[PDB]
Short mmCIF file of N, CA, C and O and ligand atoms in Angstrom, two decimals:
data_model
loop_
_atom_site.label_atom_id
_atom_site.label_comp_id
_atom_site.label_asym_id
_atom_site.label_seq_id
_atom_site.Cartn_x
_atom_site.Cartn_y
_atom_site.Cartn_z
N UNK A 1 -80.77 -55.82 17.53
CA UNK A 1 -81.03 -56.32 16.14
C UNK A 1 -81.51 -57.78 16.19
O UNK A 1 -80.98 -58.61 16.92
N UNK A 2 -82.65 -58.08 15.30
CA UNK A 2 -82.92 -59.34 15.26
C UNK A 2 -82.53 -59.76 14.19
O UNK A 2 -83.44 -59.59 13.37
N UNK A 3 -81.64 -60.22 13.72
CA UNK A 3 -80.66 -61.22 12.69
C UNK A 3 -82.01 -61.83 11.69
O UNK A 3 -83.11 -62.16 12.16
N UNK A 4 -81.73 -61.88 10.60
CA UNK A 4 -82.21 -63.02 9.78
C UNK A 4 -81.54 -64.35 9.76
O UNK A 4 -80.36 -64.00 9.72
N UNK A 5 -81.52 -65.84 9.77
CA UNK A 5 -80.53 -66.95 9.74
C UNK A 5 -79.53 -66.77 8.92
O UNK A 5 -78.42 -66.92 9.44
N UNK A 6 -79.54 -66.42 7.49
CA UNK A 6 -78.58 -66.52 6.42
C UNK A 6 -77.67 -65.27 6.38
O UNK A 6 -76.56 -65.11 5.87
N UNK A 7 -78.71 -64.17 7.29
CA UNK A 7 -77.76 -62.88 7.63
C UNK A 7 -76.33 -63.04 8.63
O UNK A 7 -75.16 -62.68 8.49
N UNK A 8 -77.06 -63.76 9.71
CA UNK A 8 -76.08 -64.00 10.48
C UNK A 8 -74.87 -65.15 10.29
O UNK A 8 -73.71 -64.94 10.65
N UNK A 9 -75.27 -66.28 9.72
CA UNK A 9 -74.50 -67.30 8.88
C UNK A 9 -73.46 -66.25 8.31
O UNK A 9 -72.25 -66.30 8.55
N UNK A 10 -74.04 -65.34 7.58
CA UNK A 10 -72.62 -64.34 6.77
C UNK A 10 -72.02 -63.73 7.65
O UNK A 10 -70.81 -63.65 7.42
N UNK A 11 -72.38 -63.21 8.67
CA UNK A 11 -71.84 -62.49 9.68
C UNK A 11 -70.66 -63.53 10.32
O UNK A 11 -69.49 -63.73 10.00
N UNK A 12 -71.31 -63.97 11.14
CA UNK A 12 -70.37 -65.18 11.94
C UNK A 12 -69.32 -65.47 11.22
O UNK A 12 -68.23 -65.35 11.78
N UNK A 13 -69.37 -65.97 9.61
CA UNK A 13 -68.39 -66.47 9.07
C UNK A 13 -67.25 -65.70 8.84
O UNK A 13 -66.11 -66.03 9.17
N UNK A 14 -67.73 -64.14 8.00
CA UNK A 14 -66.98 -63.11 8.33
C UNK A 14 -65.75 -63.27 9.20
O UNK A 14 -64.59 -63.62 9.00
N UNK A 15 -66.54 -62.82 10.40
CA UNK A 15 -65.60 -62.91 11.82
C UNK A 15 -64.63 -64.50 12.01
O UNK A 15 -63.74 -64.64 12.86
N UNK A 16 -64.97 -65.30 11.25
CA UNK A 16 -64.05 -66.50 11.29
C UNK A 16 -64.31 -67.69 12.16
O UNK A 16 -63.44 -68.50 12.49
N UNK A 17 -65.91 -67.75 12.62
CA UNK A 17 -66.23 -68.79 13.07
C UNK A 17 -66.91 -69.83 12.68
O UNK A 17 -67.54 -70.65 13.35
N UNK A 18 -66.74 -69.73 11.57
CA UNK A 18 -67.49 -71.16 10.47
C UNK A 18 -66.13 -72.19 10.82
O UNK A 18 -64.98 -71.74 10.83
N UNK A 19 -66.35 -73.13 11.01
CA UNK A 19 -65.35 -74.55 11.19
C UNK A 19 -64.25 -73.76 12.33
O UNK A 19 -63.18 -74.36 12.23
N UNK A 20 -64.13 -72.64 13.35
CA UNK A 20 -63.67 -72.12 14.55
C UNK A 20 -63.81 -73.52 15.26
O UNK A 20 -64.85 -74.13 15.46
N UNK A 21 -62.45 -73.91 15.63
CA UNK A 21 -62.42 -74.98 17.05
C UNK A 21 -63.05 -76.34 16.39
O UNK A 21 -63.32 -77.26 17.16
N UNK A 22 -63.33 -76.51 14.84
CA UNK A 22 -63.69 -77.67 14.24
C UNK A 22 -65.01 -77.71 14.34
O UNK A 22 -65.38 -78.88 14.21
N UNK A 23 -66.06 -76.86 14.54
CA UNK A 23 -67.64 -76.47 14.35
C UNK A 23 -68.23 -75.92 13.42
O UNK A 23 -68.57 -74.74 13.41
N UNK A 24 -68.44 -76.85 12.43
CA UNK A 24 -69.17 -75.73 11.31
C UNK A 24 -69.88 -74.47 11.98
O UNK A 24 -69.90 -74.05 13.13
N UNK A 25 -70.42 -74.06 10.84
CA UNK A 25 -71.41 -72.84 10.91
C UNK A 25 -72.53 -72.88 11.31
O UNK A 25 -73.19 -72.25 12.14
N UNK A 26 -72.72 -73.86 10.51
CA UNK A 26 -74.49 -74.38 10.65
C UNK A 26 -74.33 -74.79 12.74
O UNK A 26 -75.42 -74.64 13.30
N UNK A 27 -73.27 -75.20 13.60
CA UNK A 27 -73.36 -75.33 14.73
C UNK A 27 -74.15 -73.78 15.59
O UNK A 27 -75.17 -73.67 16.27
N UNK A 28 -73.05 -72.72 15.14
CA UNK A 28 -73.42 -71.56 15.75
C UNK A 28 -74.25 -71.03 15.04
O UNK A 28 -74.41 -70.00 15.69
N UNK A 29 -75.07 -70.91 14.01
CA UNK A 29 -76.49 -70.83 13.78
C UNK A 29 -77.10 -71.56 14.81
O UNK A 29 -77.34 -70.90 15.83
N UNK A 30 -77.37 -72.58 14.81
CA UNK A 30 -78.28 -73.79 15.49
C UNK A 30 -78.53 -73.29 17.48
O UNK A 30 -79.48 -73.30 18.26
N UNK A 31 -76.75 -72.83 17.54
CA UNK A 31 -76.42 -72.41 19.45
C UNK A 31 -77.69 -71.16 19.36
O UNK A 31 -78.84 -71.21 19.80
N UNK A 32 -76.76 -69.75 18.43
CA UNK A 32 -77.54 -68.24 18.66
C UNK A 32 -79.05 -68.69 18.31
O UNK A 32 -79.84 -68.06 19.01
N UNK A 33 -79.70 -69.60 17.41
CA UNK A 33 -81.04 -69.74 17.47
C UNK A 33 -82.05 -70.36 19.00
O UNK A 33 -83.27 -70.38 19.21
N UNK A 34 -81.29 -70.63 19.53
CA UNK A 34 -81.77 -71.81 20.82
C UNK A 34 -81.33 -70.58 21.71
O UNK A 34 -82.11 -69.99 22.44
N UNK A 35 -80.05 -70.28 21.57
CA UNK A 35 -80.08 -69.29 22.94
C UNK A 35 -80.23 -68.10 23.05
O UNK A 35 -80.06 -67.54 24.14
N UNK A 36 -80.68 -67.28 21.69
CA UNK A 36 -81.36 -65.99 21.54
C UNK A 36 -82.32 -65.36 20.59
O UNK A 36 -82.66 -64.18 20.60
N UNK A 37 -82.83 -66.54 19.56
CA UNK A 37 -83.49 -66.81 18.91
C UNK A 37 -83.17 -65.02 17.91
O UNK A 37 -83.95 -64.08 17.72
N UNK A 38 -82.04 -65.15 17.59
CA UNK A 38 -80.57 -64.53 17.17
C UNK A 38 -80.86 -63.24 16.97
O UNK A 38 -80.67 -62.62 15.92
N UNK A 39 -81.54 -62.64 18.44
CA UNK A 39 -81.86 -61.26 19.42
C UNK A 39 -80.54 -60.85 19.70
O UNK A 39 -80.02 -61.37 20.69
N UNK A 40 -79.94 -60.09 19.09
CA UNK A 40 -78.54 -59.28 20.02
C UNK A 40 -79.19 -58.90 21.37
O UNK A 40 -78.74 -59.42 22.39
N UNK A 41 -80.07 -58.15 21.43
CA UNK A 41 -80.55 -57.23 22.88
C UNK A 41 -80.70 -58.52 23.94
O UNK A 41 -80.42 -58.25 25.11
N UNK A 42 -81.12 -59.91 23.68
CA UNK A 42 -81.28 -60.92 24.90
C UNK A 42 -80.00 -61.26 25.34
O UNK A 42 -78.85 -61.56 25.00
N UNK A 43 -81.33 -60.92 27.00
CA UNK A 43 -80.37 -60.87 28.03
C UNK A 43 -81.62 -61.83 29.03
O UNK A 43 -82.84 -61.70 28.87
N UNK A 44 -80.97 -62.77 30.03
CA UNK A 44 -81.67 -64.11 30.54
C UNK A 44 -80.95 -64.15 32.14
O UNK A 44 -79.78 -64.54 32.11
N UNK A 45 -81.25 -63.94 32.95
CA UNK A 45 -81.23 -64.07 34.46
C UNK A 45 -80.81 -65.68 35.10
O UNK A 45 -81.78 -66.38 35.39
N UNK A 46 -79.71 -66.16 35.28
CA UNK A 46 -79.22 -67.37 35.27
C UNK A 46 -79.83 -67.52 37.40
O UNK A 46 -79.77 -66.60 38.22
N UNK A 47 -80.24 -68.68 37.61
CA UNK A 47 -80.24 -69.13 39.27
C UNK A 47 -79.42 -68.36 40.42
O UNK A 47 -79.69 -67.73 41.44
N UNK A 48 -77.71 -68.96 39.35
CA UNK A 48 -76.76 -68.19 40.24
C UNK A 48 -77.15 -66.93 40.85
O UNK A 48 -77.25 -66.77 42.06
N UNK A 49 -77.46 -65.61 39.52
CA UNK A 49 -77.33 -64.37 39.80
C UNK A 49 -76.35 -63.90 38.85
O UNK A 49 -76.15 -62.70 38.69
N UNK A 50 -75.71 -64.80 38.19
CA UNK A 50 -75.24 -64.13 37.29
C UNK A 50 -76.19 -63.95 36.06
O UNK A 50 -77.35 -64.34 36.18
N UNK A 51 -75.70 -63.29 34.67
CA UNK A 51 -77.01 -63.20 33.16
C UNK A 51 -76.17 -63.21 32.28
O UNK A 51 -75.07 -62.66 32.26
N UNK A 52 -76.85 -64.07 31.23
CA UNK A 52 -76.57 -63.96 30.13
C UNK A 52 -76.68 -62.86 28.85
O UNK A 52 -77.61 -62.06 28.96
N UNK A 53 -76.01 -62.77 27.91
CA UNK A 53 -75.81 -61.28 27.56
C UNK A 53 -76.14 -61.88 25.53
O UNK A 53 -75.32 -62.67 25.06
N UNK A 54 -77.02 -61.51 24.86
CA UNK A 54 -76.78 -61.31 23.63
C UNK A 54 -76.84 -62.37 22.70
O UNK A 54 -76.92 -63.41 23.35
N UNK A 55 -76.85 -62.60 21.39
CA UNK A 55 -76.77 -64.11 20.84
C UNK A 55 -76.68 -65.27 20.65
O UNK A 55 -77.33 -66.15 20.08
N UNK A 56 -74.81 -65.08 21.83
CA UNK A 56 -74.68 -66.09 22.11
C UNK A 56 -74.83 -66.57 23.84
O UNK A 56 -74.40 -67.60 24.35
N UNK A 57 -75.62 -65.37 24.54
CA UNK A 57 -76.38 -65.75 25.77
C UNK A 57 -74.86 -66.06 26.60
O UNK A 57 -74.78 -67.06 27.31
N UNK A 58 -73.89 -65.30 26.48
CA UNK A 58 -72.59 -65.08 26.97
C UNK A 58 -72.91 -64.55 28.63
O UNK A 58 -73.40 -63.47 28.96
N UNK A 59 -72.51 -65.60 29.45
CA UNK A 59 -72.18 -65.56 30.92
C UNK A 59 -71.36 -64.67 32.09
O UNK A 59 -70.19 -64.88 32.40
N UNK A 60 -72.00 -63.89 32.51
CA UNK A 60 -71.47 -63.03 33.32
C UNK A 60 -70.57 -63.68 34.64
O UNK A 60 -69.82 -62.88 35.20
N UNK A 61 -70.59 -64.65 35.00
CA UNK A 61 -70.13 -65.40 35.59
C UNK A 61 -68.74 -65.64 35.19
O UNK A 61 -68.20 -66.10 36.20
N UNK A 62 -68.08 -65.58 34.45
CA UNK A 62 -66.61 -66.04 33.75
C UNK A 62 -66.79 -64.85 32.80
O UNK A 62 -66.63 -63.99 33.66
N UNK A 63 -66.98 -64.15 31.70
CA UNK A 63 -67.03 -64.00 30.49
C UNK A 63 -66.68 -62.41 30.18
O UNK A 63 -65.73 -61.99 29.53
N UNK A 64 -67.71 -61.67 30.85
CA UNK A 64 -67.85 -60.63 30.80
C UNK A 64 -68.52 -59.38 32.00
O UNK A 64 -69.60 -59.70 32.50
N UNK A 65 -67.97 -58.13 32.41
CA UNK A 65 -68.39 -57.87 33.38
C UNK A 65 -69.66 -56.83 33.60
O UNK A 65 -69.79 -55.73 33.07
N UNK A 66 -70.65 -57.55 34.64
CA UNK A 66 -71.88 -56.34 34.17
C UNK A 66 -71.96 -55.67 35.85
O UNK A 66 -72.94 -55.04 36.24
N UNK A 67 -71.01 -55.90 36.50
CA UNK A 67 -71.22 -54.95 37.88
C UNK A 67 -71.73 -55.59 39.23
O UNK A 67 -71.56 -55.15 40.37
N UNK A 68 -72.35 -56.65 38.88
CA UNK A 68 -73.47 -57.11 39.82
C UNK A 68 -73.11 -58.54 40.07
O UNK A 68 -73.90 -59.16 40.78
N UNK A 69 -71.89 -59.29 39.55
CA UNK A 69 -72.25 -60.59 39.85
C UNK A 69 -70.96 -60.99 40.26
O UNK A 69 -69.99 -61.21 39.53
N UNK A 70 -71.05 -61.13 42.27
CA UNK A 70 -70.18 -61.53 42.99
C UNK A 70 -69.25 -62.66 42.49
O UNK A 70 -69.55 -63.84 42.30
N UNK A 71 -68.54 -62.31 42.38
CA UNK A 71 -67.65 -63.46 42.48
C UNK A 71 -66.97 -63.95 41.18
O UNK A 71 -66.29 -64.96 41.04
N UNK A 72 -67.33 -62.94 40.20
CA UNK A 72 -67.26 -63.72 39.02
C UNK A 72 -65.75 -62.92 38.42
O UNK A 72 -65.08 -62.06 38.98
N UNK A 73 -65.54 -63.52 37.18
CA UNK A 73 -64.67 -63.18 36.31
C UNK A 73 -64.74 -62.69 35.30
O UNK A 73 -65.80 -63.12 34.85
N UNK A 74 -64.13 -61.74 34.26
CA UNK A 74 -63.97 -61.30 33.37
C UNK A 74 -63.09 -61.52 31.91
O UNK A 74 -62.49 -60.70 31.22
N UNK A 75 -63.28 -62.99 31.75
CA UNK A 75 -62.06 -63.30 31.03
C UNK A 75 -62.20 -62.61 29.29
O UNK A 75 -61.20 -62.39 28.61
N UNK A 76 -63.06 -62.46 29.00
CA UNK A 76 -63.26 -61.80 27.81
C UNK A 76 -62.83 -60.11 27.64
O UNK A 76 -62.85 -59.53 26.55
N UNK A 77 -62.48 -59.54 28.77
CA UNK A 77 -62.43 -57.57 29.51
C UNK A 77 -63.36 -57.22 28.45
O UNK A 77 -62.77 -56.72 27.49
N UNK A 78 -64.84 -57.34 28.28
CA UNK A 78 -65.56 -56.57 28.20
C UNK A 78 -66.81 -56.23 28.98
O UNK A 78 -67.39 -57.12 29.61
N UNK A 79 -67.32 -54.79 28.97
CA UNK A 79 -68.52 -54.80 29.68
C UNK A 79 -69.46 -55.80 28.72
O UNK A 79 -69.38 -56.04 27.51
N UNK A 80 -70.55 -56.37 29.95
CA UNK A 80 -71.62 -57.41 29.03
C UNK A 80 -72.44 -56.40 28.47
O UNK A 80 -73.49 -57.02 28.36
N UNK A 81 -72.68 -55.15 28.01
CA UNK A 81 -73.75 -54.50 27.86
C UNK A 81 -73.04 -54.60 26.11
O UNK A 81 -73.76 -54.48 25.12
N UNK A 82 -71.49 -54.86 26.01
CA UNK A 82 -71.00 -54.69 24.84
C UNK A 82 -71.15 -55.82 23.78
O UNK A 82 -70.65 -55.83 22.66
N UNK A 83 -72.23 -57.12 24.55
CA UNK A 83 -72.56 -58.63 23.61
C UNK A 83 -73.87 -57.94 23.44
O UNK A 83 -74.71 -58.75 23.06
N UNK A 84 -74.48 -56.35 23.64
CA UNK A 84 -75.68 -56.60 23.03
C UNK A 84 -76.19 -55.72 21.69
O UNK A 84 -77.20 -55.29 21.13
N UNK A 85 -74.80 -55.75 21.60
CA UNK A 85 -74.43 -54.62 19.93
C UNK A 85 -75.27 -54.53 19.09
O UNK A 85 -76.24 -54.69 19.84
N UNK A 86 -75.61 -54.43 18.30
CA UNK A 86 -75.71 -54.86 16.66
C UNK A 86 -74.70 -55.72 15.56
O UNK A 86 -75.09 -56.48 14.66
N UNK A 87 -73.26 -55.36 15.91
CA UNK A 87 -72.32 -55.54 15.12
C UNK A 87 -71.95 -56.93 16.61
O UNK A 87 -72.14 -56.94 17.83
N UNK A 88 -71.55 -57.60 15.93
CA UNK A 88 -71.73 -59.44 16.98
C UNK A 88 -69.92 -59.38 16.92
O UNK A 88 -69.64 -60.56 17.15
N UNK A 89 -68.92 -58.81 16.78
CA UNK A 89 -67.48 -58.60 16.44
C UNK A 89 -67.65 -58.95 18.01
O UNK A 89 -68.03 -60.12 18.07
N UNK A 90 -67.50 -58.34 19.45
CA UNK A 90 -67.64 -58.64 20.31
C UNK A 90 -68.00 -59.81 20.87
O UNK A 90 -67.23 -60.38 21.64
N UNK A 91 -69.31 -60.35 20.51
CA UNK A 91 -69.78 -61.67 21.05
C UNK A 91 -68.94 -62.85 20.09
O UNK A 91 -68.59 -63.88 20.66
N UNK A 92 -68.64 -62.69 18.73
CA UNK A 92 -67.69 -63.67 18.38
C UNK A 92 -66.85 -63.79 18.87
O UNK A 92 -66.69 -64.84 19.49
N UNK A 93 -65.84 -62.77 18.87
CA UNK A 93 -64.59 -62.56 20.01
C UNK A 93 -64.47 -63.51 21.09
O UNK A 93 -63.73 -64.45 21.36
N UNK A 94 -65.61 -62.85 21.70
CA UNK A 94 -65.82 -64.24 23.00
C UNK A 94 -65.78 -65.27 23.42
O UNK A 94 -65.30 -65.82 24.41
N UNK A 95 -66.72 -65.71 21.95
CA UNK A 95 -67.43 -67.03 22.05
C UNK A 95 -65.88 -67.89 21.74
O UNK A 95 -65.48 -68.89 22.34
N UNK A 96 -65.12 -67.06 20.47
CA UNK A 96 -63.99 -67.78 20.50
C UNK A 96 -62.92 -68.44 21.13
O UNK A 96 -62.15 -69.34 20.79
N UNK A 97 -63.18 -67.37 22.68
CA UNK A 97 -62.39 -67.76 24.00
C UNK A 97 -63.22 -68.98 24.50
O UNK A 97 -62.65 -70.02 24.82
N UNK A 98 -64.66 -68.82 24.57
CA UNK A 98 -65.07 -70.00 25.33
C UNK A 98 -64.90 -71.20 24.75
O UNK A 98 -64.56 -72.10 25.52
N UNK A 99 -65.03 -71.49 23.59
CA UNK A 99 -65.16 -72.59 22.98
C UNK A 99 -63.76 -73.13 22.92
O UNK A 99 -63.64 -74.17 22.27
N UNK A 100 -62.82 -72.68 23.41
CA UNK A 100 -61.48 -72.75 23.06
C UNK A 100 -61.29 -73.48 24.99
O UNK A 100 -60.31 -74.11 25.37
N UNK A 101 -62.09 -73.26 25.57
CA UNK A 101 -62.16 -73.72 27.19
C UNK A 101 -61.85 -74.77 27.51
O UNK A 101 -61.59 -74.93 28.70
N UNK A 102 -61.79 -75.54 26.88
CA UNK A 102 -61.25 -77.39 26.64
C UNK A 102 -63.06 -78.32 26.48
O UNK A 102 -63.17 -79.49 26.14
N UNK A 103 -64.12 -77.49 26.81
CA UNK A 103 -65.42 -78.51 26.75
C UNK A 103 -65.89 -77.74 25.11
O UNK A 103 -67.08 -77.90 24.85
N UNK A 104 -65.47 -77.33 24.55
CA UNK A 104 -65.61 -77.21 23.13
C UNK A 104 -67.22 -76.35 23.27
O UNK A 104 -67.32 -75.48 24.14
N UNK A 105 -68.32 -76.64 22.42
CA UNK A 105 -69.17 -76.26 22.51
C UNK A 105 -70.37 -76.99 23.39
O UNK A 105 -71.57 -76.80 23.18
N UNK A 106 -69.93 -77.69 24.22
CA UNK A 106 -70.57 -78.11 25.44
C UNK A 106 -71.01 -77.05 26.74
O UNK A 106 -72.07 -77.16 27.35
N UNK A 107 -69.84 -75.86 27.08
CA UNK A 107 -70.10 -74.56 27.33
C UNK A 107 -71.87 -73.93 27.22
O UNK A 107 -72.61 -73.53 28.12
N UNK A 108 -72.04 -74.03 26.15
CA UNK A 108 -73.49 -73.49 25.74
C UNK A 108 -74.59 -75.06 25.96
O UNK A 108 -74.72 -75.94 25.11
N UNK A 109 -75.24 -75.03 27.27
CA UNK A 109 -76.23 -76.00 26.99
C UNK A 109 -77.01 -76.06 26.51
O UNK A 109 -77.47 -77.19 26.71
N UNK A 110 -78.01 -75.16 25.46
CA UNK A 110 -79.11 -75.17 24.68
C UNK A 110 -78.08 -76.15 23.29
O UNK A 110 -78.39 -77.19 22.69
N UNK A 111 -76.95 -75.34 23.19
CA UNK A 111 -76.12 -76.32 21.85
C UNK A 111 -76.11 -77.69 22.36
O UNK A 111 -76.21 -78.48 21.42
N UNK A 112 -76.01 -78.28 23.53
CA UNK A 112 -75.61 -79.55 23.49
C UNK A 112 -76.83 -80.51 23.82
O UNK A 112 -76.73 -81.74 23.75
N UNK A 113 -78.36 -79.67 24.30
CA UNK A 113 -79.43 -80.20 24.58
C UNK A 113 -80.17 -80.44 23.23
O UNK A 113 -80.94 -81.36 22.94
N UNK A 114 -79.69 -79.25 22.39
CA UNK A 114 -81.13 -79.13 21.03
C UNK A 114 -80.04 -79.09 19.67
O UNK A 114 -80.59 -78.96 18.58
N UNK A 115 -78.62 -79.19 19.66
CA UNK A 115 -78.21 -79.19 18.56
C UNK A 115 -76.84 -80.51 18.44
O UNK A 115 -76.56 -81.37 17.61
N UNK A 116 -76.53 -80.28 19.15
CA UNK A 116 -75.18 -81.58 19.37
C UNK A 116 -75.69 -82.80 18.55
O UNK A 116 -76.67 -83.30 19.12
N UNK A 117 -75.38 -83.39 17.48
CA UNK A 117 -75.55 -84.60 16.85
C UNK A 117 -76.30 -84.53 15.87
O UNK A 117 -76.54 -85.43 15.06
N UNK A 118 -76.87 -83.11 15.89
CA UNK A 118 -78.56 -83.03 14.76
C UNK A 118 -77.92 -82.43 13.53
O UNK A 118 -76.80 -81.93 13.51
N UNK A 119 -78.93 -82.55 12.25
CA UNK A 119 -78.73 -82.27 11.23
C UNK A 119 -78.43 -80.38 11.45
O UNK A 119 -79.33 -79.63 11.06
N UNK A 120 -77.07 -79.74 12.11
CA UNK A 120 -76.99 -78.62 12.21
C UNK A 120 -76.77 -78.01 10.87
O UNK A 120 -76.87 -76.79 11.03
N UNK A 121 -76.48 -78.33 9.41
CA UNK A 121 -76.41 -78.01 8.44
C UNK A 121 -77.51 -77.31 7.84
O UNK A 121 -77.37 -76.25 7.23
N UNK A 122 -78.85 -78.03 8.06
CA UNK A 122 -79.91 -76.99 7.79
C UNK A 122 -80.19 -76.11 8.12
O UNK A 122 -81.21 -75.48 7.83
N UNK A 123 -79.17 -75.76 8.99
CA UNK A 123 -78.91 -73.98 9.73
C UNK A 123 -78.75 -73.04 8.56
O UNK A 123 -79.43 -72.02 8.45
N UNK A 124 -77.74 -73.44 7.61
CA UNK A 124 -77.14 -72.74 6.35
C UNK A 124 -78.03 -72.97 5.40
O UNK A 124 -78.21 -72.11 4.53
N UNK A 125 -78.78 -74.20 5.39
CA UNK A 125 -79.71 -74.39 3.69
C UNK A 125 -80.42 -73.03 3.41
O UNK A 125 -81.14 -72.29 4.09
N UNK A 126 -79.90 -72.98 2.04
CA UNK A 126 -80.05 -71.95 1.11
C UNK A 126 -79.64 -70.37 1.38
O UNK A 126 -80.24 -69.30 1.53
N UNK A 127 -78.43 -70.77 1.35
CA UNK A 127 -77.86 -69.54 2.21
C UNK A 127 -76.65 -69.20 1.10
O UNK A 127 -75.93 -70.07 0.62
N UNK A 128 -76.54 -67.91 0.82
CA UNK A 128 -75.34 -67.44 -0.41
C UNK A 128 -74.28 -67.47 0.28
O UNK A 128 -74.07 -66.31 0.63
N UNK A 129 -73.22 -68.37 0.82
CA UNK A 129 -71.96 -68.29 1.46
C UNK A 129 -70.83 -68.49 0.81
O UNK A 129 -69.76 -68.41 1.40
NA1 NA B 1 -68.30 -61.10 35.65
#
């Protein structure tokens, strides 16, 4: 599914991650736009060998397990094929563990390269919330 912005703004919030860990909304708009240009199906091939999975471009490396990536962890117990849903209940889930990691939303580097400090509010402008 490719999300509309104000679709997913409702979604996310839903699930309880509007101001989650002290991050507005308009933050995780701003992350899923930069790191999946808010594509459930993207999926991104990291150096390591591990990949990223879905919206929020969720890390096989720690996060979630897709079979193939030595060494890694599963702290979320889901398969990664399950961040590339339609329904984002899963990838919120997640994201809620990571951000909860002690580096807040530093975790996601597209958030801290292209959104950290910026007017992330115009994520939500004109949005029925
Ligand atoms: Na893994």
């Amino acid at each position: 599914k490719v999300f509309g912005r104000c679709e997913l703004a409702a979604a996310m919030k839903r699930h309880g991650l509007d101001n989650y860990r002290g991050y507005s909304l308009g933050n995780w708009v701003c992350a899923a736009k930069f790191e999946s240009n808010f594509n459930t199906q993207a999926t991104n091939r990291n150096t390591d060998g591990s990949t990223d999975y879905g919206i929020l471009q969720i890390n096989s490396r720690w996060w979630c397990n897709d079979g193939r990536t030595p060494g890694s962890r599963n702290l979320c117990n889901i398969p990664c094929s399950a961040l590339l849903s339609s329904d984002i209940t899963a990838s919120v889930n997640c994201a809620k563990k990571i951000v909860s990691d002690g580096n807040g939303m530093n975790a996601w580097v597209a958030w801290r390269n292209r959104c950290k400090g910026t007017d992330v509010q115009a994520w939500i402008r004109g949005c029925r919330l």
